[PDB]
Scaffold this active site. Structure first.
Site, mmCIF file in Angstrom:
data_model
loop_
_atom_site.group_PDB
_atom_site.id
_atom_site.type_symbol
_atom_site.label_atom_id
_atom_site.label_comp_id
_atom_site.label_asym_id
_atom_site.label_seq_id
_atom_site.Cartn_x
_atom_site.Cartn_y
_atom_site.Cartn_z
ATOM 1 N N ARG A 1 0.923 -1.402 -0.077
ATOM 2 C CA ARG A 1 -0.097 -0.052 0.037
ATOM 3 C C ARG A 1 0.742 1.187 0.260
ATOM 4 O O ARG A 1 1.686 1.444 0.711
ATOM 5 C CB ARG A 1 -0.716 0.009 1.439
ATOM 6 C CG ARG A 1 -1.852 -1.150 1.373
ATOM 7 C CD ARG A 1 -2.847 -1.117 2.428
ATOM 8 N NE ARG A 1 -3.763 0.316 2.384
ATOM 9 C CZ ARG A 1 -4.965 -0.034 2.786
ATOM 10 N NH1 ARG A 1 -5.657 -0.761 3.369
ATOM 11 N NH2 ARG A 1 -5.757 1.527 2.841
ATOM 12 N N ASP B 1 -10.063 -1.946 -18.158
ATOM 13 C CA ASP B 1 -10.881 -1.815 -16.793
ATOM 14 C C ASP B 1 -10.155 -0.833 -16.065
ATOM 15 O O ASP B 1 -10.153 -0.801 -14.774
ATOM 16 C CB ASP B 1 -10.879 -3.013 -16.133
ATOM 17 C CG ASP B 1 -12.358 -3.038 -15.015
ATOM 18 O OD1 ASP B 1 -13.066 -2.502 -15.457
ATOM 19 O OD2 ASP B 1 -11.684 -3.325 -13.961
ATOM 20 N N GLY C 1 -12.514 4.862 -13.134
ATOM 21 C CA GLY C 1 -12.353 6.003 -12.458
ATOM 22 C C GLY C 1 -11.773 5.693 -10.808
ATOM 23 O O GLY C 1 -11.087 6.611 -10.277
#
Ligand SMILES: Nc1ncnc2c1ncn2[C@@H]1O[C@H](COP(=O)(O)OP(=O)(O)NP(=O)(O)O)[C@@H](O)[C@H]1O
Ligand SMILES: [Mg+2]
Ligand SMILES: [Mg+2]
Ligand code: NA
Length: 438
Positions: free
Chosen positions: A226, A311, A314
């Site tokens: 992350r 794909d 947003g």
């Protein structure tokens, strides 16, 4: 407490914390059925808002707050398990945020007022526990552990957000937070696909999240580091950096993640209210470095074309929020969707009104750039550079792979074939872009 002892004095307010700092309050008015967000005076002068549409002056509308929060929620079966576990109504966003509030995307922890935090600790996981969930999702839902729902990131694919330091995984609890997102495959070779695609971006020098393939018994999963987190080396503490996805940045509902926001249905094919390239690029103006941001967005678009990522919607582009403006995050969720040929695909965002990836030629690319008000040479240079470097990059990435079985090796061979073919296709007409009369 010396004041009100009504439960609601505590339960209708979630304090907003950034690390050990309280920066404001998310409040819910029972009577009006509305949200509100107010920040402390220090934070108004020094910090940044949750999103561009929840401003520091506190005037953020209930609806903008609501949609922002919904965009933090799981988009898979994890959402239903969460709702069920709490016994709340589907539209009770407040209760859902309360439930996942200690670890959401970004840096803000939503904490019940005047309540004792759950104990700060880890819940270690054994590989065998993951395996039983892979093998029997009905008996063993991936998202529920020790009887409690655990998922607090978005996206439709099965996954867990976990704490990880290179050997064993665990759930973070209390003030600790997850550091990695582990994604499981429900389609063939999806882990290898995303690993290759993400590592390809890295080798090409793009700004992209770090990924490893990890193993749970025989099963592979993708472990993504992350970028809204940093585990401090030498102690048990995870620092957070705030992010928003492009939906949140535009003040859009999760329902507008795709440009064609009502779907592939032909009755709605011209309803294009969702995140589009023109809208995404419009966000550069809010960035610390608008020109650099647009270059990143363009590189992203071109990379996604060359790798067949249909794909790139947003919620698959994000920004850091900072006191001085937004900054695009490293890329994530890069997958060669084109590899799944039992599915007919459209681009998430159109180029020159074209949604079919196979029908992108020099005209469409020239029109795309003209319509963004960017010079075509920026596309020509980047597209040529990336396409020409991909043959070496993909060779480099294949060396990063773990041992493959026969079917996996064949997948990788096909991946490479298709990849090289897209490169050659685009190189075949890139030098036309300059001369196109749009
Ligand atoms: N490296 C990362 N650092 C921080 N947040 C991340 C990272 N990767 C993903 N996220 C967040 O987690 C969400 C889900 O991750 P993602 O890899 O997009 O899963 P997904 O299931 O493949 N999503 P999608 O296929 O688009 O419905 C993203 O929308 C981001 O909000
Ligand atoms: Mg995604
Ligand atoms: Mg995805
Ligand atoms: Na698509």
């Amino acid at each position: 407490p010396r004041g009100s002892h009504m439960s609601t004095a505590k339960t209708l307010t979630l304090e907003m914390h950034l690390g050990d700092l309280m920066i404001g309050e998310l409040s819910f008015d029972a009577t009006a059925d509305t949200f509100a967000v107010h920040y402390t005076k220090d934070w108004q002068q020094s910090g940044f808002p949750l999103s561009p549409t929840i401003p520091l002056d506190g005037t953020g509308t209930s609806n903008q707050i609501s949609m922002f929060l919904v965009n933090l929620l799981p988009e898979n079966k994890g959402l239903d398990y969460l709702i069920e576990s709490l016994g709340v109504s589907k539209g009770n966003t407040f209760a859902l945020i309360r439930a996942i509030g200690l670890d959401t995307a970004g840096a803000i922890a939503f904490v019940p007022k005047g309540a004792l935090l759950p104990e700060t600790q880890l819940r270690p996981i054994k590989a065998e526990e993951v395996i039983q969930r892979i093998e029997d999702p009905t008996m063993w839902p991936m998202e529920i552990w020790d009887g409690k729902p655990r998922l607090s990131v978005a996206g439709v694919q099965p996954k867990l957000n976990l704490f990880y330091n290179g050997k064993e995984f665990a759930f973070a609890e209390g003030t600790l937070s997850s550091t990695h997102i582990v994604k499981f495959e429900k389609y063939h070779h999806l882990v290898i696909n995303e690993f290759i695609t993400m590592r390809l971006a890295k080798v090409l020098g793009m700004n992209v999240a770090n990924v490893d393939i990890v193993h749970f018994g025989r099963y592979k999963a993708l472990c993504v580091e992350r970028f809204d987190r940093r585990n401090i080396p030498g102690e048990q503490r995870v620092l957070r950096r705030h992010i928003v996805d492009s939906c949140q940045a535009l003040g859009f509902s999760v329902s507008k993640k795709y440009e064609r926001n009502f779907g592939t249905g032909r009755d709605v094919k011209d309803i294009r209210e969702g995140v589009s390239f023109n809208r995404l690029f419009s966000l550069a103006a809010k960035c610390r470095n608008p020109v650099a941001a647009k270059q990143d967005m363009l590189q992203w678009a071109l990379f996604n074309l060359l790798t067949g990522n249909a794909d790139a919607h947003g919620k698959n582009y994000s920004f850091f929020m900072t006191p001085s403006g937004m900054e695009p995050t490293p890329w994530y969720d890069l997958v060669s969707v084109d590899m799944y040929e039992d599915f007919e695909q459209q681009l998430a965002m159109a180029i020159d009104d074209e949604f079919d990836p196979n029908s992108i030629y020099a005209y469409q690319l020239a029109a795309f750039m003209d319509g963004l008000g960017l010079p075509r040479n920026l596309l020509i240079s980047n597209l040529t550079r990336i396409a020409r470097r991909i043959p070496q990059a993909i060779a480099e990435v294949i060396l990063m792979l773990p041992p493959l079985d026969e079917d996996e090796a064949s997948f990788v061979a096909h991946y490479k074939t298709q990849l090289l073919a897209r490169c050659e296709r685009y190189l075949g007409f890139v030098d036309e872009v300059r001369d196109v009369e749009v």
